Amino acid sequence: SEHERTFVMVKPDGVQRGLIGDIVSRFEDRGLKMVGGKFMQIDQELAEEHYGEHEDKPFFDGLVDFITSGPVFAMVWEGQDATRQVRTMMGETDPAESAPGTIRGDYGLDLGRNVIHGSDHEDEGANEREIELFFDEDELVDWDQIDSSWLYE
Amino acid sequence: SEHERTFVMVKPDGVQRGLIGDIVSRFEDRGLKMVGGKFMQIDQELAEEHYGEHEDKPFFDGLVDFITSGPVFAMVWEGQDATRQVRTMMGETDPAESAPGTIRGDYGLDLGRNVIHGSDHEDEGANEREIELFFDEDELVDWDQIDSSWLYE
Amino acid sequence: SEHERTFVMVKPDGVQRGLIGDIVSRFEDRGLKMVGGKFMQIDQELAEEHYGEHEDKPFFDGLVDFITSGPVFAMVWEGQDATRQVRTMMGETDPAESAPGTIRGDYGLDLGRNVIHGSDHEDEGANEREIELFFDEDELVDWDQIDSSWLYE
Amino acid sequence: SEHERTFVMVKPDGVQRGLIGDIVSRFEDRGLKMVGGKFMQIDQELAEEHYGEHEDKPFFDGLVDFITSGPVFAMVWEGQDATRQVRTMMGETDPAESAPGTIRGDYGLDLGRNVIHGSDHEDEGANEREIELFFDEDELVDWDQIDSSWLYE
Amino acid sequence: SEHERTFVMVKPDGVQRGLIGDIVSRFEDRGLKMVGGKFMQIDQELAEEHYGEHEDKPFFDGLVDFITSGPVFAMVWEGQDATRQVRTMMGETDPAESAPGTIRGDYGLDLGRNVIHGSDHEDEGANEREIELFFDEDELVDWDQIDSSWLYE
Amino acid sequence: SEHERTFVMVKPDGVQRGLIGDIVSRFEDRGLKMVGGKFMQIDQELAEEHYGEHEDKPFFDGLVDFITSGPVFAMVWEGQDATRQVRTMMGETDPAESAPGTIRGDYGLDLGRNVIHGSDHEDEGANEREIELFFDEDELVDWDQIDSSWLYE
C-alpha cells in the first residue's frame, strides 16, 4: 500500500449545498493526497456506463437523472489504504445510518441524496475502473506531498 | 417522513460554556431545518412539568434546580427522520460513553451536565409533547429551505 | 457599558443559506452574551414599523417584501461597546465593500442581500428602540455568563 | 454582473501545504459559484504564456520554475463583482502586507510564496484571458446554484 | 474522579504536519483542563525510558529514532475520567482502524505514524508514571477553570 | 529574517476562556513555527520584570495582579518578519479597536483583558529580551518544519 488510489466524487447534492471545500479539507487533513480533481457535468453516456450494474433495475433512470441534474466534483486521492479509508470516512451508504463524524453523518439525510461517492474497496479493482472511467492518464498528477515523509514509516 | 419535527435544547451548561453556534451549525450542516428557536429561562412550573416522569425520584429536585440555574436555547428542527437523527448526533445520554463526533462526545464530560437535550424517538409522540410544551403554534414557522430540494428525492 | 445591549438579526437570506450557527459563534467567540433569541417571521406591520424612516421612499416596498419573504433569527447581545462592536464585526452596509473577516465580507455579495442586521451605534437609542420593537422585556434574560469574570476588568 | 467570472488558482505552495479545501470553502461560504475546477500541472509553455508580460525581466525564470514546481488547483468562480471580490479576499500581493482574514494574511509569509493567484480587476479583460488560457469553454459548467435566489436582488 | 490527570503528547508527525492547535482545541472544547504543556525535544535517555517495556523487541530502535526525529508537544490534561476519555478521543492505536471524529481517524494513515500519544487507562497508574517522567511537579499548574462549575455536578 | 523569532503568550483571560488551540492554529495555519511552548504561572517577580518599564506608574500593580491571576501559555514562533506579522495578526492593543479577523477583534472586548501578548516590532530587541525573559535557551528547539521548503523563496 501507500501509492493506492481511489475515485471520489462530490455528487450534485453536495455541490449544490456548498460542501466541496468542507469535504476536500477532510481528505487533506487526513494526509490523503489529491492527484486528480475535476469540476464537470456528467453526460448520459458516462452516467449509464457508471451505473451499468443497475441497467435492468427499475430505479436506474432516476439514478441517471440525479447524477445528471447538476455538476459534480470528481477526485482521485492517494495514500495508504485510501480506498477503504475514504469509505470509512464517508459513512454508510445511507446517511441516516451513519455516525456523526462521517461525511454523510454530518451533512446528509436521505438514502438517495447522500452528498458523495467513493470507490468500493470490497469490489476488487473498482477504484481503478472508476478512475480510468473519469480521468484520462494525462489528467492525473505524479507528485510528492510534503506530508508523505511524516505520514509513512 | 420529511416534515418530521423534534424538540432540541442547549441546556444551561452548553449555554454558559458558549456552544449555541457550534451546535446549531451541526444541525444546519446536516440539512435539518430550524422551525423554532427561543432563548429563554425555564421556570419551576415548566421544569417540573418537563421532568414529570421523575416526580417521585430522589434526584428530581436537583434536576429541576440545574435546568433552572440559567437560560436555555430551545429549538424545533425539521427533516426526514429528524428525531432519531438528532439523538444519534448528540451521542449517548452519558458524554463519557459517547464517541468523538457526537455533540456530547466532543463537548461534555459528566452524566448530569451533558450540554444538550433531544426528544426521545423511542418514546412515541415524545417529540410532539415536548414541542407543544415549549412552543405555542404561533412561535413555529412554516417555510421551505433552499436545501430541501437537494436533500430529499 | 458592560451591560450595553444591541439588536441583531440574521436576515432571511442568511437564514436560507444556513448561516445562523456561524453567526452566533462569531458573537459567543467574541464574549458577547446572548440575552434574546427568537426564530420568527416578521409580519408586514412589524416590517413597516422597523423601516418606518424609509416609508416615503421608492425602495420601501422592496425592503418590506424581502425582510418578510422568509424567517429571520432575531437576537439581543450584551457586552461592553456591544453596538459598535457588532457593527465592526458585520462589515460595511454593502458586502461588496466589506473586508474579509467581517460577516458580510465572508458570506455576502449584494448590497440588498447583506445577510445580517445590527443596530447602528451612530444613531443614539436605535439599539434601544429596535430591541423593544422585536422583544417584549420578559422575552429577555438576566443572567451572568462565566466569561465576564475574565472578559472585563 | 451576476454572471461575471474570475480565474483563481491555488499555487503549488498552497497545494503542498494542504490548503485547497480551506480556500474553496472561503469562496462557497461567500456564495461565489464554482464553474471551473481542474487539478493540474502547468507545463513550461503554459507557464511562460501566463507570465508573458514579464518575459524580458530578470525574475521571469524564477517565476516559471516555481509555478511549475508542483501541482496547482486552477478554478473559475462566478458571482456579482467576482474579480474584485476575489482580490479583496486574497489580500495584498505580499502576504507580509496582508490583513488577518484575507487568504494570504492567514496562510502565507513570503512575497514569492503567496499561496494563491486571482485575476486582477484593475487590468480589464484579464479574467477573460486567464480563464481562456487555463480552460477550454467546454471544461466550464453552466448551472444554477440554489444560493443565488437569495444571494441576489 | 474529576481532578484525574493524563499525559498526552502530539508526536513528531503531528508537530511537523501542523496539528498542535487542532488537537488542543479538541481537548479544550471537551472541558478538559490543561495543567501541563511543554514544547520539547525528547533525548535518548528519555525515549528509551519511555519505551522500556519494548527494550528487547526488534522494533525498539526504530521507535526511539522516530520519537527522536523532531520535537513533541507534551501535555497534561485534567478532568473527570480524563484518561479513558482522551483515549476514546484519539481513536484506536492504528489510525486505519479508527472512526472519523477521532484524532487519528481524521488526521492519520499509518500505524507507526499516528500523530499522538495518550496514557493507557487500562495500565493502572500509567498516567502518573508518564506525567512524572515528563514533568517535574513545578511544571504543573493548580488552577480552576471557569468551565469547571458547569462541567461537573 | 526566515529564522526571526517572537515571544507570544495567551494571557490568563484567553487561557480561562479556552482559546489556546484556536490561537496556536492561527499561527500554524500561517506557517509560523513553534520553537518554544510552556504552560506556566508567572510568579510576581517575573511579572514585575516583564512590566518593568511601567513600574513607577499607577496601573502597575493592576497589571501584575492580572497577569499572575491565572496560568498563561507562553510561546516562541519562528518565521520571516515574525514579530510584525504576529502583531498584525493580534490586532490593536484595545480589542475594541481591532478588526474582525485579528485575534483580539474576534475574541476580546476590554482593553485590559485583551487575551494575548506579542513582542512589539517597533521596539527593537524587545522580542529578544522577552524571549530570554521567559525561556532559557535550552527550552527552545532547533528543527526544520516541512512547510518552509514551500513557505520561503
**Nearest residue to D42 (alpha-carbon basis) of D134, D109, D105:** D134
Q: Which residues contact A104 (CB under 8 A, 6 or more apart)?
A: A90, A91, A92, A94, A95, A98, A114, A115, A116
DSSP string, F16-27: HTT-HHHHHHHH
For residues C118 and C30, is the Cβ–Cβ distance under 8 A? Answer: no
Contact between chains at A79 and E112 (C-beta distance less than 8 A): no
> CB of D101 within 8 Å of any CB in chain C?
yes
State how far Cα D71 lies from the chain centre: 14
Q: Does E151 touch chain B (CB under 8 A)?
A: yes
Which 3 state secondary structure label does DSSP give D45? helix
- CA pair distance F12, F86, nearest whole angstrom: 19
Buried b (16+ CB within 10 A) or exposed e, B55-94: eeeeebeebbebbbbbbbbbbbbbbbbbbbbbbbbbbeee
User: Mapping DSSP to helix (H, G, I), strand (E, B) and coil, where does residue F143 land?
Assistant: coil
Return d(Cα D5, Cα D36) in angstroms, integer: 10
Query: B99–A101: do the CB atoms touch at under 8 Å?
Result: yes
| CA–CA min distance E59, chain B (Å) | 31
Nearest to C8 by CA among C88, C105, C70: C88
3 state SS for A37-106: EEEECCCHHHHHHHCHHHCCCCCHHHHHHHHHCCCEEEEEEECCCHHHHHHHHHCCCCHHHCCECEHHHH
SS3 B112: coil
Neighbours of A36 (CB within 10 A): 22
Which cell goes with E146?
471557569
Give the resolution in Å. Answer: 2.6
**Closest by alpha carbon to A28, among D39, E46, C7, C119?**
D39
Total tally of structural domains belonging to chain E: 1
Say whether F9 sits in a helix, a strand or coil: strand
Which chains form contacts with chain E, at 3 or more CB pairs under 8 Å?
A, B, C, F
Count of alpha carbons within 13 angstroms of residue C7, beta-carbon side: 20
Beta bridge partners of B39: B73
Cβ contacts (< 8 Å) between A139 and chain D: which residues? 40
User: Cβ of E113 and A88 within 8 Å?
Assistant: no
Grid cell in block for residue B39: 432563548
Question: Which of F32, F79, F101 is the closest to D99 by Cβ?
Answer: F101
User: Which helix (H) or strand (E) covers residue C6, if one does?
Assistant: strand C5-10
- B56 min Cα distance to partner chain C (Å): 30
Please give the C-alpha separations between residue F105 and each of B100, C121, F91, F97, in angstroms, as whole numbers. Answer: 30, 17, 6, 8
Query: How far is Cα D134 from Cα A79, in angstroms, rounded to an integer?
Result: 28
C-alpha cell recorded at residue F81? 518578519
Query: Cβ C105–D99 below 8 Å, yes or no?
Result: no
Contact present, D72 and D42 (Cβ < 8 Å): yes
> Residue E101 region, left (φ>0) first, then alpha (ψ -120 to 50), else beta?
left
Whether F127 and F83 have beta carbons less than 8 Å apart is answered as yes
- The amino acid that residue D107 corresponds to is Y
Enumerate the β-bridge partners of residue E39. E73
Domain that holds residue E95: 1-153
Instruction: Report the distance separating Cα B90 and Cα B101, nearest Å.
Output: 9
D92 touches chain F (CB under 8 A): no
Sheet containing C72-78: order of strands: B116-118, B5-10, B72-78, B33-40, C33-40, C72-78, C5-10, C116-118
This entry's atomic model was obtained through X-ray
The runs of H, that is alpha helices, within chain B are: 12-16, 20-30, 44-50, 60-68, 82-90, 103-107, 126-134, 148-151
Residue D112 near residue D41, CB atoms below 8 Å: no
Which set of grid coordinates corresponds to residue D122? 484593475
Number of neighbours of residue B43 by Cβ within 10 angstroms = 10
Tell me how close the Cα of C80 comes to any Cα of chain F, in angstroms.
7
First to last CA, chain D: 12
Q: Is B7 annotated for ligand binding?
A: no
Across the interface, of D101, D150, D151, the residue whose CB is closest to C101 is: D101
Distance separating alpha carbons of residues A34 and D107, to the nearest angstrom: 20
d(CA B26, CA B116): 13
Query: SS3 string of chain E?
Result: CCCCEEEEEECHHHHHCCCHHHHHHHHHHHCCEEEEEEEECCCHHHHHHHCHHHCCCCCHHHHHHHHHCCCEEEEEEECCCHHHHHHHHHCCCCHHHCCECEHHHHHCCECCECCEEECCCCCCCHHHHHHHHHCCHHHCCCCCCCCHHHHCC
- Please give the Cα distance from E123 to E120 (Å, whole number): 5
Neighbours of C2 (CB within 10 A): 14
Closest residue in chain D to residue A34, using alpha carbons only? D39
Give the integer Cα–Cα distance in Å for C49 and C53.
8
Rounded to 5°, angle at Cα D96 from D95 and D102: 40
Q: Cell numbers at residue A61, please?
A: 433512470
Q: Degrees (nearest 5) of the Cα angle B13, B19, B20? A: 105
User: Partners for B (CB, 8 Å, 3+ pairs)?
Assistant: A, C, D, E
Residues of A in contact with B32 (CB under 8 A): 109
Active-site pick, C3, C50, C117, C121: C117
Side chain identity at E117, as an amino acid letter?
H
Q: Are E143 and F71 in contact (CB under 8 A)?
A: yes
Which CATH number belongs to the domain containing residue E109 in this structure? 3.30.70.141
E25 contacts in chain C (CB < 8 Å) = none
Which residues lie below 8 Å from residue A125, measured CB to CB, with a gap of 6+? none
Contact E149/C146, CB-based, under 8 Å? yes
C78 forms beta bridges with C5, C33
Chain F interface, best mutation among A28, A145, A146, by max F CB count within 10 A: A146
Put simply, whether B151 touches A (Cβ < 8 Å) is: yes
D36 close to D66: Cβ distance less than 8 angstroms: no
Give CA–CA dist E98/E103, Å, rounded: 9
Strand, helix or coil for residue B60: helix
Residue with cell 500593580: F61
All three cell numbers of E113, joined, read 505514524
Determine which of D110, D111, D115, D116 to mutate to test the interface with F (most F C-beta atoms within 10 Å): D110
**Which residues in chain D touch residue B150, judged by CB atoms under 8 angstroms apart?**
146
Annotated ligand binding at B104? The verdict is yes
The alpha carbon of residue B120 and the mean position of all alpha carbons in its chain are separated, in whole angstroms, by 10
**Is the separation of the CB atoms in F4 and F83 below 8 Å?**
yes
DSSP, residue by residue, C19-62 = -HHHHHHHHHHHT-EEEEEEEE---HHHHHHHTGGGTTSTTHHH
Residue type at position E132: E
First to last CA, chain E: 12
d(CA D138, CA D36): 10
Strand order in the sheet with E72-78: E116-118, E5-10, E72-78, E33-40, F33-40, F72-78, F5-10, F116-118
| Closest-CA distance of chain F to residue A149, Å | 9
When CB atoms are compared, the residue of A16, A107, A109 closest to B80 is A109
Of all residues in chain F, the one with the smallest CA distance to A149 is: F146
Buried b (16+ CB within 10 A) or exposed e, C36-64: bbbbbbbeeebbbebbeeeeeeeeeeebb
How would you label F102-134 residue by residue, b for 16+ Cβ within 10 Å and e otherwise?
A: bbbbbbbbbebbbbbbbbbbeeeebbeebbeeb
D81 and C105 Cβ atoms separated by less than 8 Å: no
Q: Which amino acid is at F35?
A: V
| Nearest alpha carbon to residue D141 among A43, A68, A40 | A40
Strands A33-40 and A5-10, how do they pair? unpaired
Q: Which residue of C has its CA nearest to D79?
A: C109
The verdict on whether residue E127 carries a ligand-binding annotation is no
Asked if B146 is an interface residue toward chain D (Cβ–Cβ < 8 A), one would say yes
- Interface membership of C146 toward E (CB under 8 Å): yes
Q: How many angstroms separate the CA atoms of B141 and B78, rounded? A: 11
**Closest CB from A30, A91, A103 relative to E109:** A30
Facing residue for B99 by CB, picked from E31, E80, E101 = E101
For cell 475502473, the residue is A129
Cα Rg, chain F, nearest whole Å: 15
Pairwise CA distance, residues F63 & C40, whole Å: 45
Residues in chain D closer than 8 A to C102 (CB atoms):
101
Q: Rounded to a whole number, what is the distance in Å from the CA of D108 to chain B's nearest CA?
A: 27
Q: Is D135 annotated as a binding residue?
A: no
Q: Which helix (H) or strand (E) holds A128?
A: helix A126-134
Q: In this complex, do E151 and B109 lie within 8 Å of one another by their Cβ atoms?
A: yes
CB–CB of D108/D93 below 8 Å? no
Q: Please tell me the distance from the alpha carbon of residue B90 to that of residue C92, in angstroms, as a whole number.
A: 37
Through-space distance between the first and last CA atoms of chain F, rounded to whole angstroms: 12
Which one, of D80, B104, B6, D31, lies nearest residue C13 by Cα? D31
Q: At what angle do helices F82-90 and F20-30 cross, to 10 degrees?
A: 130
Interacting residues of F152 by C-beta distance below 8 A, sequence separation 6+? D109, D110, D112, D113, F2, F80
